[PDB]
Design a protein around this ligand. Structure first.
Ligand SMILES: Nc1ncnc2c1ncn2[C@@H]1O[C@H](COP(=O)(O)OP(=O)(O)OP(O)(O)=S)[C@@H](O)[C@H]1O
Ligand SMILES: [Mg+2]
Ligand SMILES: [Zn+2]
Ligand SMILES: [Zn+2]
Lengths: 187, 411, 15, 96, 139
């Protein structure tokens, strides 16, 4: 049943250790980059994320490009495409005249510049950028609901165990085989 | 004299129509191109047959309306064309009252450009624009029909109201105090319908064959069969098989768009050439990212935490009344059981003294914003608050966005 | 009570 | 008897659920009085019985209740409707 | 009854106020299906909490009639905190945190007589040894 007498070596035995045998900044940056990658709609726009994320988060672009592993939009051809789209519309009645304000209107109606340029533009002041992007996010309450961990393969929760190789969670023999064959990253 | 024209300039679809009209129209504001290069505009996207790899281009880059060319193109298509939209025709624009909407946090320069174009390129007589949450308090002025649920059981505007605007871009927590939102308590939850679609993309690409390019297909899949767990994630996972549904993949010879079947209910046999995709866990695990972003490996906080922080930043005396008068709107809220779960989870965190009353409009929740905006447009408050064309001409371009519309006045 | 005095001074859709 | 411990645990767990719910604490209601002889004294017990503070509780309850009556007179028609005023909600919270 | 969210013992404003530890009231926050409530408890209840080994997240049960603290178990919220742990996970209590209920029982007079003759109180060695003894009928 139970051994009332146990042999211990003074050098080896210690209660602090029992043994028998036969987010970091980079991590949160990677997770945020994954979220922004998953946000975009068009697949062709996937490799355009790093510039926008560098503009938003503020980290240098080369650092996110190198350390973090993932997974110029308008032309005169866009004007031609707009011209082809004109055929659907039916009833315009235009007229214009020239002045400085009209020149400004023309510049606005011929921008063809991206949100990255606006964010990088010096006209957007520091506190304006702060309120527009950083202030709206949560700053005090970070997690009030419980933390729920699920199977990385099928989302199950009845049984949970961590794979020996990379430390990610699985739940069953079938999920074990699936992870080992296709999902395991570090091997 | 003419009734005002009301437009909801959403980043995904544009709701518009005369204030006299009962229900608005639709305009999916996006210029799309196919694999072979043919282009489609606005509602013509519904007419595509090769749905496989169509690319969407939109003017709202990240909720901010940047590229004005196509925005003007879709405005022209939606307003001027009378053939498609039931004979409605905006003849000249001059002498027409326009009330619009915009993202609650727009850059001052971008809002300046917006006001400039909408005032001088189109020459409207008067204009009023603000986020939809600003128009929400005016539900008191009309006899609305909105179902409400309390979390503790199984002079033309309301002074205190809290609006949860979950749309395509982001989910907003906008508490409005007597009409002006308390912009310091405005909190942005980055999770939204676009991210929900992307998450469905990734999950379906892993669990089943690669659907990483079928954007409209997955959008329809999200449209037809999705739900938040009525009780909790564990409860839905226990009964995953009972509530399972199967989705019929598109058949180009018979139906350009797919459809969902209920296996339990008796229905017609499928032809043998039809491929079927079963959904057993992605039905509920995808919407759960609103409450538990950790499930999809997202570091961002959830909706309940955002609401709690927004309440915290509010003045102490008004925050319980703000809790009691929370109203939900936006495209995402029409998926079943979201309002009930929001109410229950919010009540579980508040002190027992307070009670939360959650009211969500019936029917398509996307049309609610336009409805309340139009009903506000036909009130004396709109007559007082509107800015006239000559008044705009009197001031510099920055004046309108810095004083009468934009957040720069209330910050 | 004084918070109510502070609250009543908030803008009410005017300026 | 070591092999029978699991059965004992199962049976005790089965019985506790019904035992705990619908029982009246006889110790609380002074129905059990055989331990009192060990730690209590006759004159001390009778003095504590004489020195009970029911009157203070009743007078404080009546004072609070008359304050509530005055507050209800000031407020008027009380209702549990959805709150749109700080004054009304604050007064209702004070009442509750 | 509810799930423990906070436990913040407070000391007296002055060290001379009390003896030894000089422990004042304890503040406990309980969570239920209908909300949360912050309670102010006597130091005796704090001692009971310590005896029952209650930590944050455990579902507890306090009787204001007697001052008895019971540990129902661990909340289902923290079910997946550890993949292997011996804890009786229980759901969050329904209703309000502070529920008042009227309990009615039918008991015979012989039940009261037996309760007085063989009381179950006491945690001494003698008390436990008597508990182990057979319950022989007595006059
Ligand atoms: N039945 C539905 N189930 C789930 N999602 C839906 C459903 N119907 C519509 N949606 C989504 O709801 C959104 C509708 O867009 P809106 O709520 O109108 O946002 P928007 O106002 O157009 O753009 P914003 O305001 O700048 S975020 C889209 O993301 C749709 O995919
Ligand atoms: Mg919208
Ligand atoms: Zn699994
Ligand atoms: Zn692994």
């Amino acid at each position: 049943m139970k051994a009332l007498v146990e042999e211990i070596d003074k050098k080896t035995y210690n209660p602090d250790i029992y043994f028998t045998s036969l987010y970091t900044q980079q991590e949160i940056l990677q997770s945020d980059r994954r979220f922004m990658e998953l946000n975009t709609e068009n697949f062709s726009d996937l490799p355009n994320v790093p510039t926008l994320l560098s503009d938003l988060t503020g980290v240098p672009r080369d650092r996110i490009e190198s350390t973090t592993k993932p997974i110029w939009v308008l032309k005169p051809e866009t004007l031609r495409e707009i011209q082809l789209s004109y055929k659907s519309t039916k009833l315009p009645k235009p007229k214009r005249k020239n002045t400085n304000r009209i020149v400004a209107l023309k510049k606005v109606l011929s921008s063809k510049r991206n949100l990255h340029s606006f964010l990088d533009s010096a006209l957007l002041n520091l506190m304006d950028k702060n309120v527009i992007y950083h202030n709206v996010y949560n700053k005090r309450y970070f997690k009030v609901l419980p933390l729920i961990t699920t199977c990385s393969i099928c989302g199950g929760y009845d049984s949970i165990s961590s794979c020996v190789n990379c430390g990610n969670k699985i739940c069953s023999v079938s999920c074990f085989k699936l992870h080992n064959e296709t999902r395991c990253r570090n091997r | 004299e003419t009734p005002p024209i009301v437009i909801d300039n959403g980043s995904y679809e544009i709701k518009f129509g005369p204030s006299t009209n009962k229900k608005p129209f639709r305009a999916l504001n996006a210029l799309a191109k196919d694999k072979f290069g043919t282009s489609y505009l606005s509602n013509h996207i519904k007419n595509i047959k090769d749905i496989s790899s169509i690319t969407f281009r939109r003017p709202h880059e990240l909720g901010q309306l940047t590229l004005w060319e196509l925005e003007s193109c879709i405005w022209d298509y939606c307003l001027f064309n009378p053939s498609e939209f039931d004979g409605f025709d905006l003849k000249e624009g001059k002498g027409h009252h326009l009330v619009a909407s915009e993202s609650c946090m727009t850059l001052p320069e971008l809002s300046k450009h917006a006001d400039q174009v909408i005032f001088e390129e189109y020459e409207f007589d008067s204009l009023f624009k603000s986020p939809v949450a600003v128009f929400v308090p005016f539900t008191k002025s009309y006899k609305g029909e909105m179902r409400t649920i309390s979390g503790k059981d199984e002079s033309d505007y309301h002074d205190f109201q809290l609006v949860i605007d979950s749309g395509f871009n982001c989910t907003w927590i906008i508490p409005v105090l007597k009409g002006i939102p308390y912009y310091k308590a405005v909190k942005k939850l980055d999770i939204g319908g676009r991210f929900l679609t992307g998450l469905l993309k990734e999950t379906l690409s892993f669990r089943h064959y690669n659907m990483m390019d079928e954007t409209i297909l997955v959008n329809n899949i999200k449209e037809q069969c999705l739900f938040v767990s009525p009780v909790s994630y564990f409860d839905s996972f226990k009964t995953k098989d009972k509530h399972a549904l199967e989705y019929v993949l598109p058949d180009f010879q018979t139906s350009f768009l797919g459809y969902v079947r209920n296996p339990r209910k008796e229905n017609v046999p499928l032809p043998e050439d039809a491929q079927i995709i079963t959904l057993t866990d992605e039905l509920f695990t995808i919407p759960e990212t609103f409450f538990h972003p950790e499930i999809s490996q997202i570091t961002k906080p959830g909706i309940v935490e955002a609401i709690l922080e927004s309440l915290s930043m509010l003045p102490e005396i008004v925050r319980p009344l703000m809790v009691g008068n929370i109203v939900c709107t936006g495209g995402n809220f029409n998926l079943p059981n979201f309002a009930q779960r929001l109410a229950a989870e919010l009540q579980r965190q508040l002190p027992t003294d307070w009670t939360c009353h959650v009211s969500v409009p019936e029917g398509d929740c996307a049309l609610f914003g336009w409805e309340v905006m139009s009903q506000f447009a036909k009130t004396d408050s709109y007559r007082k608050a509107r800015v006239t064309r000559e008044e705009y001409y009197e001031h510099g371009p920055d004046w309108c966005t810095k004083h009468r519309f934009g957040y720069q006045n209330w910050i | 009570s004084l918070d109510l005095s502070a609250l009543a001074n908030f803008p009410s859709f005017g300026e | 008897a070591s092999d029978y411990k699991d059965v004992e645990r199962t049976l005790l767990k089965l019985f506790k659920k019904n035992n705990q719910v619908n029982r009246v604490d006889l110790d609380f209601l002074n129905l059990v009085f055989t331990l009192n002889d060990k730690d209590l004294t006759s004159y001390h017990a009778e003095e504590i019985s004489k020195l009970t503070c029911v009157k203070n509780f009743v007078e404080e309850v009546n004072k609070l209740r008359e304050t509530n009556k005055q507050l209800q007179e000031e407020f008027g028609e009380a209702s549990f409707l959805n709150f749109q005023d700080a004054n009304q909600y604050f007064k209702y919270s004070n009442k509750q | 009854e509810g799930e423990v969210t906070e436990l913040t013992p407070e000391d007296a404003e002055n060290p001379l106020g009390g003896y030894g530890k000089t422990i004042s009231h304890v503040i406990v926050g309980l969570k239920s299906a209908k909300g949360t409530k912050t309670l102010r408890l006597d130091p005796t209840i704090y001692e009971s909490i310590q005896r029952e080994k209650v930590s944050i997240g455990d579902v507890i049960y306090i009787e204001a009639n007697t001052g008895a603290v019971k540990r129902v178990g661990r909340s289902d919220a923290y079910a997946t905190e550890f993949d292997l742990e011996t804890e009786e996970y229980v759901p969050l209590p329904k209703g309000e945190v502070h529920k008042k209920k009227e309990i009615v029982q039918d008991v015979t007079l012989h039940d009261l007589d037996v309760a007085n003759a063989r009381p179950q109180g006491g945690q001494d060695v003698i008390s436990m040894m008597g508990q182990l003894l057979k319950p022989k009928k007595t006059e």
